[PDB]
Each structure stands twice: as structure tokens, then as C-alpha cells.
Amino acid sequence: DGVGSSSGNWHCDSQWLGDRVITTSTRTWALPTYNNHLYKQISNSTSGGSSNDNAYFGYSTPWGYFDFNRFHCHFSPRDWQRLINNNWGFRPKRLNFKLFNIQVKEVTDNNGVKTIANNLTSTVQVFTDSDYQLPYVLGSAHEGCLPPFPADVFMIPQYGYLTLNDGSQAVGRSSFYCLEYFPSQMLRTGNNFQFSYEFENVPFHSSYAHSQSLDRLMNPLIDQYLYYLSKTINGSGQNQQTLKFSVAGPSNMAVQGRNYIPGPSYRQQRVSTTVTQNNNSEFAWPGASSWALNGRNSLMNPGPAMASHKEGEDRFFPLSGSLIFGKQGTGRDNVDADKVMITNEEEIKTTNPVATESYGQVATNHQSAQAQAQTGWVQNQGILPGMVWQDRDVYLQGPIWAKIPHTDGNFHPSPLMGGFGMKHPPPQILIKNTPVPADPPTAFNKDKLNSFITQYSTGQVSVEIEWELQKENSKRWNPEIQYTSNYYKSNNVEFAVNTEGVYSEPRPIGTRYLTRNL
Amino acid sequence: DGVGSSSGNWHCDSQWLGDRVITTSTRTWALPTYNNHLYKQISNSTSGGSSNDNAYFGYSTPWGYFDFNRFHCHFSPRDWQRLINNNWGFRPKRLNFKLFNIQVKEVTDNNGVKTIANNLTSTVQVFTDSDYQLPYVLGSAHEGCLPPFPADVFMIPQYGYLTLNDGSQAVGRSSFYCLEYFPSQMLRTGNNFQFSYEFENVPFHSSYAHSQSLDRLMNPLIDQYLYYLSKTINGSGQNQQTLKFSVAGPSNMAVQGRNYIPGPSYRQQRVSTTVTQNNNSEFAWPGASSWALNGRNSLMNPGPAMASHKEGEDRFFPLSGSLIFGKQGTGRDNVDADKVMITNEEEIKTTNPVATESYGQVATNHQSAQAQAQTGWVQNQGILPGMVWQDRDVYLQGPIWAKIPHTDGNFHPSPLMGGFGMKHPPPQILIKNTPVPADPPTAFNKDKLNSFITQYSTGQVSVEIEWELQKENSKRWNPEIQYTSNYYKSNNVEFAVNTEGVYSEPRPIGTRYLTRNL
Amino acid sequence: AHSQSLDRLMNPLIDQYLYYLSKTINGSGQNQQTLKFSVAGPSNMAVQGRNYIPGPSYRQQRVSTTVTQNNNSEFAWPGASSWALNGRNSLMNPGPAMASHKEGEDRFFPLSGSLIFGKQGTGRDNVDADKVMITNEEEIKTTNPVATESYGQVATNHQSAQAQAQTGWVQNQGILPGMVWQDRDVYLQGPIWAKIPHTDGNFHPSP
Ligand SMILES: OC[C@H]1O[C@@H](O)[C@H](O)[C@@H](O)[C@H]1O
């Protein structure tokens, strides 16, 4: 429209209908010029990397992008409480995105003194990758999200991507992408941008914990009509061999026949937060579970979903097998345990093997009169028919969706870090300040212009997501576990601003409070 | 609309119809950035407070708000005179509010020299809390009103609020509010804002004084048919006991039967403006009437409405029991009596007990041949059926409405400081300059941006209130008391500007001049 | 429950335009008398003018569940709040709704002023505190006076050059205009309705 008109309004609320929740978030952003308007080849060579496991090849772009892919972008802590205490499930449905009130600014420096002024004719350009033709970086859990607290102003992160490498080198199959080779909308102050998106059908996240365990599903009062082998010897001494059979029943539940078995396992090393209980060695990398791809070792960072500890063992956690969030102000490198927050998957204990335990035991031989029966431990167990499992829980600090990789086959493509896997996730939204040349020379020169006006932009972003709810139908008589604030006096309010103005999230909050039968 | 068009006009007049008055006020405001765009936890610890009675916990916000809640915002002194001399009652009916001609400005400092320029693309954001979802601070009598004199330019006050505390700490029941989590309208120069409001039904304020007193309502010429106990002894000496009864009549009015009794009382300590008549001790706090809430003592600052002094005792005033206004230029702390203006409620003397007197006397025992009759003084008297009272008078300097607290029960929820109590008062109007980041760094950083362009806004506000009038029907023969200016020569005109340009209000003006029968 | 208290409803950042009497003497010594006035503001919140005051009070005796803190006497009936009807004394068993204790004082409870439920299998007569369940009204602390405290203080005299200012404690306070209160909370074990007695008049007939 024009210089003097606002191109959009602040809309931050949430709206609870019967089976639907509509979250709306507005934030203020700032976009720098990245890479001096250049595309740059980057690799572990350009960054000085060494180990082959860390080698990479790729490109950094002048562009930047929006990430709303964490839940605290869309939910206040109160809204999150309201979701998790009342609902068995939820999934995203629709998306609405807006860019408005764009302001492009010019920075001039004289001597040690900078002046900022509006550049009214400068433009910002924006496009969504709707055909998913770019490397999708939103499914890796990155910084640069919209801030959880609506009054914070955030920097837009720089877009970059990786392609195939051999060491620091690239192969011929490596692909380079110019983001200028897409059509994009150009925006002066007074222009706005919007688009809508439909989430594809995704199952409801399970926001409940089971009130039954998979090995306890029997009627405790009644025998089975099945028999098991109770006794193989008639007693001490030579040549005592029998087959004795007993009814499996209430008194021996471990031996009863069952129709369903716990889900798959890939075993994690167990680490105690009580520190003297740990070995006196460096096992962090060496003792870690990992998978290998093309000679590279990638740590298996989230487990396949697994229970983080056994009952009462809460001090234990799987080495890499859980999500670790930092507290507010926690540094980058080598921080103590009290400065991070270790998620635990304890609720899926009912259907899922413990991350730090063997799946079970198998027979390793044929017994005989000569040979005793031998068993061995199953350290990793793939899918078996009859397995049943829960996915990893999702967190207010955590990711929402991932892009399912485009491949011939996948199994149960729920993202291992948690959330909703999608073949066509919310598309990437790319934004860039268009370069404005400084004064060119008065004689022609064929070289590309390397001299530009120093410039940055700011504005507002609205994200509106419609969420579908699955209500609790339970007949449970006794009251349930719910997420609560604690009444006891404290210097600060949890999930509130500091005395210095710093918003913090004191604890990770999962979704699983309400219960269901198994 | 656009940069070059005015978005509204100055409208300041008042319009007197038959039973309606419409006041319109326009002022010029300036809005700073508050708190460097931050929410801040505040408490008596952050301010250094000590006593438990003064302890608090709360938040200061970057937002600011409009307060038109004093009468001098809407009434010129002449209009006020015209209201109070001609009318038995008035109440507010409708409200219309406008923000227009917004100007956002940028401040740059080089060395000891500041330059102010327009920022044409910057925006201001505004919303009303229509659902009363925020702590309501307009019902406490605060500075920051629209100025009584239309040519004065005023600063918008900063919005803050308190929640539950224990000492300086907060409890889990304490609530934090982000004002960004409301939808608000964004305004560039050329955008304007308006909304309308309907006052809910409120009784007319009583702008009259009674021409009768509650104990004089009888016919002075005629006896009662009731009898009272005149004499209990037949004379001096032993064993003189009788019951003698007399007709209550014109000669003894104190003893007549009456149908209605004066309203409730909570006794205030009496202070003389003649200073040698006061005790030589510090009684201000120690001798003060107070109420206790959760171990805190709050001074009972306005009385329940009560008469400020007896007849001819005008030098006396209740310790806290009246409203005290400062004169123009009166300082903050420890000022002499001549620099303030002490309101008196003298007109309600007819139906209301004197603030500094006991309500009356009650029997404390059973008399008998052994025991003399004993009485005691009633220092505080709650509501009794048959009580009748007037509310506190309202003032041109004083507040208009309060928000009735949201509770299971209340009694006669007329605000004790005076005015119109409402469950849904005029809503809070919140305004903020939207933060404009300075130049961000060219490498991504996840920290919220703490560097902003220094900025402030100005504009105009219109408030239009429709007032309903209640005319005088009186049959009184003799002329009445009216508010007047005094003809005698003076250096300045009252309610006019100074020789230095300073507007002042020389006296508090109540509403009660005309009379009614009781 | 209220997230604000009735005495904290102000804007903490802004002064009042009202004044209060801060100082009555100019100092030590004879014949020091002044009237000094100050703005009520963020630093002194206790003295600010307010539009609404806490609800009515009828004072209850305070009993500690820590037993050595109680007096060594039988006060159960003798120290109890009561009302009289036709020469009969009825213990005032539920208070008019009032806050059961001050902050952090949870060990205290009003003598009769709260509902006491028995646990399962609790006997009829003279049972220990661990066999009953003492309700507390702590949430109404924001608008309601504490059951075991005085409502406040009133002036009992006229001060003068001869007489110092005297105050006295208000043990019971009836309704005043401008009072605001919460009703007693309701419980899963508790009653639902009552019949309002059929009478000429009643006030706020919440059971
Ligand atoms: O290969 C050895 C290295 O492996 C890395 O993945 C690990 O983070 C390092 O600590 C180091 O042990």
C-alpha cells in the first residue's frame, strides 16, 4: 500500500473451541545481510575440521529463513498445561503465515559513529519452497526459532545446506542450488506476504501414559488353559530327567502366554547423574551407540523410542538416548549437569524396553545330555510381528514436525526426536534483503559489483496453526496426575520474566499425564 | 491513510441538551519507550522496601495506558459549575475514544547532541482490554490523567501490576501477564484508532445536600401517640422506684420513635488544622484506623462515607477519612497543610454519623437493685436494617468510576473514594511503541536483540462521554446555595492560567449545593 | 482463587494524586506540632486510598495442631465464639466466611471456624487430630480477613494537647458499604444446598 499505513496487526492469542485449538503468534524479527550477498562453498576444510566422521561439503547462502517448528512458538505454558491435562491427543491441521510492516534500514558509518535511516525504496524478497525443491533444514533441531516469549525480538537464521562429500571434497553427484533461481515476491514498506498450508493426515500424538503394562494384561483371578514346562529334572542325582508341565496362572505371571511383546530396542549405555557411580574413564564417545553410513560414524542420538530408566532408577539416563535442553543462559561448551535439563521417557516403560537394558535372552545352542542349555543377551532387537510400542514424547521446548526423507521405503516414520513426520511438512520460508549497490564507477567494468549499501530489515511475523484435539473418554474412578505449578514461595514465578527482563523456561514439559488402558 | 493527511480533528467542546451533557476532550500526548521494551519482575526487594505492610510482588511492562478517570478531564470548571448548580444527579452513559495523528520519532545522539527525526514506517500498537483479563489499575487514583487544561501536553503513564506475594517472594498462585499475548492494532502515521463503550446502569450520583436531618423528620406541632420511659425513680432516698411514662412530643424530640437510623460508622481519629490543639506526639500511623488482610495493615483511607466534622467544627478533619488533593506545584513529601486541599464531607451530616464521633451508646449489662445501668460507646457500627446513608461526594479533581472487584459478594459497591462502581468499567487502553532493532550482526546469534533504535511517539486523544442529567424539581421558596466565583479583585483569575503559563485549580469543588427533602 | 489481594490492586509504578498525613510532630521536644502531608505511592502502599475493603469478620480463637503451642487449659467450649438465641448459646460453628490462617501459619486453625471431616473408620467421640481432616479456607485470604485476627483498629477517643490518640481492636465487624468478600469453599465431601429460612429479611443467604 503506502509508507504511512500499517500492513498488518499484532495477533498473539489462542482460541479453544470444542475439538480445536487455534494458536496465533506474532513476533518482531530483524534480518541482516548474510555473506555479503554471496553464495559460498563451505566444508570442514573451510572450518578446519579434521575427523572423517565430521567431514562435510555444502554452501552458505545470503538468504535466511523462518523456523516456527518448536511448540513454545505456538503455546504459552498455560496453553500447554491446558492441552496436556485435558486431552488424549492432538495433531496440527492448518497453517497461516504472514509477513507485514516490513522496514528496510540503511546504516552509514562516518568515523566510529553509525547512523541508521530508513531506505523507503528498498525491498525484501520472500518465497516458500512449496515443491520441496531445496534441502530441507527445518527437520533438524536448530536454533533460530520464534522466541517462546512474545515480547522478544529475534534474529532470522542464515540458510545453508549440505550435499554429498568425500572428505572435504565434493563429487559429481553433489548439487548446488541458487535461491535466486526461484520466483520470489519483492516487498517494500507497505507490502505484505502471506500463504496458507494444510498439514497432511498425521496420527494424533499420544498425550497419555498407559495405566497398564504389556506384561500385566491378564485377569489376575483366573488360570490360563495353556501349559508351560515347569520342571526338567526330577531331582538331584544322575539320570533325573522329566518333562513336567503346569498351568500358567495368577501365581506365576512371568510364564503366561501373551499375544503381544514390547517394541524394538537398540541398547544405550547407562549414565548416572550421581557422578561417583560412573566409571573413571572417558566413555562419552567410545562407549556410545552409533550407526555407520559410508564409513562415517553417527552417534545414535535419540534412541528408537525406549524407556529411559527402570522404576526408581531416575538417576540413570541413556548416554545419548534422550533429549537434552539447556536452561536459560546455559553456555555452549562443556557445561555441568545442573545447567541442562535431561528429558526422560519414563512413561513408555509400560510398552517399551528400557534404553539401558538388554531386550531379553535367546537360546544360543541345542541342549543335550552332553550340553547344558545356553542363552545370550539380545543387545538390539529389530521389529517382530506382535511388537507394540509408543513413540517418543513431545515437549513444549521440542520440535513439532520433521520431513520424512524421500525414499523407496521407511518404517513407522515418526521422527525419532519426536513429533509428526510428514512427506510434505510446512514448507521452508526464505527471506533476503535485496542487494542495493553503492555508487558504481562512471566507466564500464564487467566485474560483478562488490560494493553495496549496508542494510538490514525488520518486521513482524504471524503464524496461525489450527490444532485438532482428542478428548479423554476415561472411566477411571480415582483422580489423575496433572501438570501443576507448585504453590511454595519462590523468588521468581516459573515461566515468567526475570527481575532483569529475562524470560526462562525452568523445566521441560512433556504431554503425558492422563492415562489410558493398554 | 497517508503521511500527508491528518487522521483526525481537534474536538474539545461540551454540549448541553435537555437531559444530556456530552463532553469531548482532546489532548496531545507523548509516549516514551518504557523498560527498554522489557517486562521486569518488581518487588519491595527491588525497590528496597522493608515493612511487611508495604511488601509487594509484581511486574512492570513496556506498555503504557490512558487514564481519563478524573472529572476535570471531561469538564471545564464552568461546565462543572453548570452541572452542580442546576442538577440533582448525573451519571455516565456512553464513551467514545480516539487515537489519531500518530507521529513516531527517532532520536540519535552523536556526542552530547541529539537529533530528532521522523520515522515514517514505525508503528504504535494499541488495544483495549475488553474482557477485563488484565489487572485493572484505573480504579486506584493515580497520576497520569489527561490534563485538566486542554493546552497541556502530557506523558502517558507506564502500565504495571501486582500479583500475590509473600514478603518480596511470589507464590505459585501468582500470575504473570504478557501484554503481547493480546491482539492489538498496529498504527503508522496515517492510521487511527477508535472504540465505543457503554456504561452499565449505575445510580445517579447525588449532587444535592439534604435540607432535613434524619432526626428532625417529625411534625414539630404534634405529639406522638407513642410513650417512652421518662422517670425510673420517684425521688431521692431509699426504695424509690417507679416506672413513669410520657408522650414523646415537640418539647422532647430526642426521645421520639423513628423509623430510620443513620448509616454505618468506622471511627476516625480527629485532627485539628489549628496545630497547638493536637497532641505533642507522632500519632499519624499509630493513631490511625486500619484494616488487616493476611497479616498486613492497610490504613482505612477513605472512611465508609461519614460526615467530616460537627457543626462549626470545620477546623477538625478525620485523620485519613477524607480526600486530600495537592495544590499546583505542591511537592511530593512532607508538605505543610497550606500546600494541600482537605476535602470535607460536611453535607452528609444529615444522614451520616460524624467520622470522628462514636456511633452511639449501647447497654453493656443488666441493671438491677444491685447493679446500676451501664453503657458503652460504639466505635464501629456495621449495617443495621433501617439504616440510611449518603455516599461520598464526588469532585472535579476526583475519580469518576472504579471497577467493582469480582467476588461472590459485596455490599453497596459504591467506590469509597467516590464515584460510580461498575462490574465492567471503561476498559483499559494500552499503548506501546513497537521495538525497532538496531543493526543486527551479520553472523547469526540466537540471543534476543537488546539493541534498539531510540524512539518515541506523540499524537492526539479524543474522549467523548455522554452524561445523563437529573433535573431539580424543588418547591423550595427561598434561594439556594450555589457555587460561585468571588467578585473581589485578585492578582490571578481562579481556574485560569498563570503569568508564567501555569494552569491551576485553586479549590476542590464538590457537587452538593442544591437541596432536597429527606 | 484470586491471583490478586484487595490491598494490592494499585499500579505499582505510579503515585496517587491523593495525600495522606505523614507527620504530626516536627521533632523531639515540647510544642512540636505540625501537619505534614505526603503523596501515597509505590513505596508506601499501606496508606494509599482504596475503593474497597475486606468483608465482615467475627473473630475465632486460634488453635495450633502443634499441641505444645496451645494453652494448658480446657478452652474448647469456654474460649469459643458463639451466638445467643432465647437464652441458649449456639457455638458459631462455621465462621462468616473468613481466611483460616495467615501466610505460612498453616498449623493454626480457627477453633470452630472450619469444616472438620472424619477419615474412614474414624470413631464418634474424642478422636485425635490425625483421625480427622481439617479444612482450610486459605484461598480467600485475598479478600477476607483472617478468622483468628482482629478486623482492624478504630479510634477510641479525641486526641488533644492533653490526650494521646487511642485505638482499639475490632473483634467483630458487620457489613460496611464497600466491603467485598468470598463465600466459603465447597468440598467433594461437603454439602451442596441449604434451604434459606423463610423470613422477612436475610443478607447474602449463602449457606
Ligand atoms: O572419534 C573420536 C572422537 O569422536 C567424536 O565423535 C567425539 O565427539 C569426540 O569426543 C572423540 O572421541
Ligand SMILES: OC[C@H]1O[C@@H](O)[C@H](O)[C@@H](O)[C@H]1O
Ligand atoms: O508500622 C510503622 C509505620 O507504618 C507505616 O504505615 C507508616 O506510614 C509509618 O509512618 C510508620 O509509622
Ligand SMILES: OC[C@H]1O[C@@H](O)[C@H](O)[C@@H](O)[C@H]1O
Ligand atoms: O456450658 C458448658 C458446656 O458447654 C457445651 O456446649 C460444651 O460442649 C461442653 O464441653 C461444656 O463446656
